[PDB]
Amino acid sequence: FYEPPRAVSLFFNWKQEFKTLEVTLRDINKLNKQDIKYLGKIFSSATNLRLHIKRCAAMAGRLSSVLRTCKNMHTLMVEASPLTTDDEQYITSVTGLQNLSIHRLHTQQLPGGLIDSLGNLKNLERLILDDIRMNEEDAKNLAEGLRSLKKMRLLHLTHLSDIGEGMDYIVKSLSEESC
Amino acid sequence: DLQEMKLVACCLTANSVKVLAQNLHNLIKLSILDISENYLEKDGNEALQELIGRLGVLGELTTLMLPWCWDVHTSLPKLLKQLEGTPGLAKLGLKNWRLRDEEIKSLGEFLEMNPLRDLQQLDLAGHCVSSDGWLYFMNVFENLKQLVFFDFSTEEFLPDAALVRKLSQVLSKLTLLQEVKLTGWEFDDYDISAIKGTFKLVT
Secondary structure, three states: OOOOHHHHHHHOOOOOOEEEEEEEEEOOOOOOHHHHHHHHHHOOOEEEEEEEEEOOOOOOOOHHHHOOOOOOOOEEEEEOOOOOHHHHHHHHHOOOOOEEEEEOEEEEOOOOOOOOOHHHOOOOOEEEEEEEEOOHHHHHHHHHHHOOOOOOOEEEEEEEOOOOOOHHHHHHHHOOOOO | OOOEEEOOOOOOOHHHHHHHHHHOOOOOOOOEEEOOOOEEOOOHHHHHHHHHHHHOOOOOOOEEEEOEEOOOOOOHHHHHHHOOOOOOOOEEEEOOOOOOHHHHHHHHHHHOOOOOOOOOEEEEOOOOOOHHHHHHHHHHHHHOOOOOEEEOOOOOEOOOHHHHHHHHHHHHHOOOOOEEEOOOEOOOOOOHHHOOOOOOEEO
């Protein structure tokens, strides 16, 4: 998906049992309702959906609006796009999300968002964290969200600052039971 | 010797349906029933449930055309319960029942426990079943095999593309599609141009 009615036509002639589709979102700047509804209605072709965010500027607040129809979703990647708190609440709102990646968050992580309602993604297994602006107490309540989900298998906490003595709460949250 | 009784757009009362449900036991061969396109003011729930409780006595009734009245989806599980008592039906028309997901999944457990595929025409008018109940309604309609002529028209509803694609898969899947009526709908270019087959569409 660069920068599209032909692919809308392509999936919208026959529909069969696709297993998984991978969506490469590249640099979404223009945003009209026709592409919102068409590219929204494409995403029900497979049984699982792998959404990839790649530097999309028009999706800074239109996460839940476009994906409201998109009930089918399996994993998601965040590559260098702005994001709001309520959109993170939409990320934690869905339960079929099993694997999640996030990269290059310059802004401070607001409370009441992803790290604060973390314990709802009850099938989380692979979680990727990079370049997140937080503080110690945000890492503490983050680790409180880590105490909830007990099906994780893979964790990335790369390139993190302002996390002095939060690792006692994080590692304390991880080393509880034989996970 | 009456075998077809057809009344539409007529000022029926709860007294008419009442005495019909008081002396209907004498009539035996009346196998085809149309009382649809009408309205019951009061006790349409009560005279309806007493009426279908009389209809359990019958053993030939294959055509049922039912009107719209007030507080009806409590009479839906007793209608469908007497049709759990009734292993035979061929013509079903249901006008303006305003049903929801719970009633269409009650019908789901009905058709998934009682296989009834002698049915040929079906009306489901004016109901506000949500889109996921339309999808599960394509699971229930996916269970069916022998529906011929039908009408799933309702209020001005925007369908989802999952409903459209299950409609193309199952409507393309079934064989006896003669005429299909959906009025009050939005199918613009791709959805309207992605269905067409052996049926006859009515907007």
